[PDB]
């Protein structure tokens, strides 16, 4: 890698690892469209297995960017419209509170207060229907944003129904395979478990537990190389030869709602570039990121703005991830760690690196 990249990465990430006690970490810096890879530490502490460029990490909520793009691909196929009522795809959702709640609302967390998590007691299709049937909104749809797995998770599950494919099959055939993300998985096959890092929470090795709508909201595992290719694909959608996927990537970076200086895409979140670093750092703290905030609609949605900071944080019990990129600058970063450490530390480090290389 260019000396300037090696230098800023050492000076930023090695102290981050020291400060946060991260057992293993992989970073990709995309500079002038090309990825440069860095690894530290161990995927499995007890077995002394180092992190490599083939190590699989849990992406947590970065998975939502895949869901958003898969939804965009379905829009480009004409299979769904974001204005469609939720009940068009789940007619059994007869409760009156669902009148007026569209796929747009589900995808952008604006349905009216769907909860952060699907309750852990939901373990069957009947349980899932009862959960959504009995949920009572706190606000009218399209007025407040409340980040929620139960919202975009349902969007993903319904967006694939016209295709007749399961969510996993749709994701594999329509996103992973065309982009050659051949070491990206919703379910890690046995032959690949040898590459699956352990997450660490309070010193204990852990993997994410199964849960309702997990694939849609937080269940993807990937390598640093596949995640760099994911960033490249979102940086340069015109390089994607499948037209519906090219357009789906673009639609996930459209701006559908605004709150403060932040814009909501499909999975992705965006700010205008140049960005105020304190806003993205402070706004990444879960005290803000998970709070209800009023939103203003953007009608029609702003087509993807190249001068944007596009990003997403993600976590599981044992992992912490961050992706950010700037299309106009062909510049991005992926940070994958097997400890869930605070979001503002992730965003600060990412800013320091990309700011140094702009």
Catalytic residues: 61
Q: Would you say 134 is a known binding-site residue? A: no
Q: Would you say 218 is a known binding-site residue? A: no
- Determine how β-strand 293-294 pairs with β-strand 296-302: unpaired
> Which SS3 state, helix, strand or coil, does residue 77 take?
coil
Q: Would you say 315 is a known binding-site residue? A: yes
The Cα diameter of the chain in Å comes to 61
The distance in angstroms from the start CA to the end CA of the chain is 16
Q: Would you say 195 is a known binding-site residue? A: no
Contact partners, residue 91, CB within 8 Å, separation at least 6: none
Question: Quick one: angle between helices 125-134 and 149-159, nearest 10?
Answer: 120
Q: Would you say 54 is a known binding-site residue? A: no
Question: Is the preceding peptide bond at 338 cis, omega within 30 degrees of 0?
Answer: no
- Quote the CA–CA distance of 166 and 159 in Å, as a whole number: 10
Phi–psi pair at 36, nearest 5 degrees: -125, 130
Strand partners, 36: 29
CA neighbours within 13 Å on the CB side: how many for 194?
1
Q: Would you say 117 is a known binding-site residue? A: yes
> Is residue 322 a contact partner of residue 313, using CB atoms and an 8 Å limit?
yes
> Which SS3 state, helix, strand or coil, does residue 80 take?
coil
Binding site listing for a beta-lactam:
61, 117, 147, 149, 315, 340
Binding site listing:
61, 117, 147, 149, 315, 340
């Amino acid at each position: 890698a260019p000396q300037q990249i090696n230098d800023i990465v050492h000076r930023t990430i090695t102290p981050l690892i020291e400060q946060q006690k991260i057992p293993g970490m992989a970073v990709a810096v995309i500079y002038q469209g090309k990825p440069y890879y860095f690894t530290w530490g161990y995927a499995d502490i007890a077995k002394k297995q180092p992190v490599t460029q083939q190590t699989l990490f849990e992406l947590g909520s970065v998975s939502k960017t895949f869901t958003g793009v898969l939804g965009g691909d379905a829009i480009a196929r004409g299979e769904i419209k974001l204005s469609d009522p939720t009940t068009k795809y789940w007619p059994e959702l007869t409760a009156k509170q669902w009148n007026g709640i569209t796929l747009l609302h589900l995808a952008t967390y604006t349905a009216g207060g769907l909860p952060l998590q699907v309750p852990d007691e939901v373990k069957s299709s009947s349980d899932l229907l009862r959960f959504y049937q009995n949920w009572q909104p706190a606000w009218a749809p399209g007025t407040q944003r409340l980040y929620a797995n139960s919202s975009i998770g349902l969007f993903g599950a319904l967006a694939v129904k016209p295709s007749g494919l399961s969510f996993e099959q749709a994701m594999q055939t329509r996103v992973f395979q065309p982009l050659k993300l051949n070491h990206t998985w919703i379910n890690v096959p046995p032959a690949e478990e040898k590459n699956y890092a352990w997450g660490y929470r309070e010193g204990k090795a852990v993997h994410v537990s199964p849960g309702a709508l997990d694939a849609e909201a937080y269940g993807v595992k990937s390598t640093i190389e596949d995640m760099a290719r994911w960033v490249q694909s979102n940086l340069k959608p015109l390089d994607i030869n499948e037209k519906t996927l090219q357009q789906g990537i673009q639609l996930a970076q459209s701006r559908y709602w605004q709150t403060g200086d932040m814009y909501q895409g499909l999975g992705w979140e965006m700010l205008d570039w140049p960005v105020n670093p304190d806003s993205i750092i402070n706004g990444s703290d879960n005290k803000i990121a998970l709070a209800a905030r009023p939103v203003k609609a953007i009608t029609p949605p702003t087509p993807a703005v190249r001068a944007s900071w596009v990003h997403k944080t993600g976590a599981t019990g044992g992992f912490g991830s961050y992706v950010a990129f700037i299309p106009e600058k062909e510049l991005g970063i992926v940070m994958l760690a097997n400890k869930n450490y605070p979001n503002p530390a992730r965003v600060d480090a990412a800013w320091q690196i990309l700011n140094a290389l702009q």
